[PDB]
Amino acid sequence: XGCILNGRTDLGTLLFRCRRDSDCPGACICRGNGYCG
């Protein structure tokens, strides 16, 4: 697998700065803005 950032309407994504997918929690991936999703 899951990804705690999928499907949320807060700014949880902004707690997870990423430069690559492996910076992200669970099976989340790094998105175009440099934060996980």
Numbering used by the authors: 0 to 36
The authors write:
Here, we describe the development and validation of knottin PET tracers that selectively recognizes human αvβ6 with single-digit nanomolar affinity.
As a result of comparative imaging studies in vivo, R01-MG emerged as the lead translational candidate. In addition, the three-dimensional (3D) 1H-NMR solution structure of R01-MG provided evidence that the cystine knot structural element, which defines knottin peptides, was conserved throughout the directed evolution process. Furthermore, x-ray crystallography studies confirmed a disulfide bond pattern consistent with the cystine knot motif.
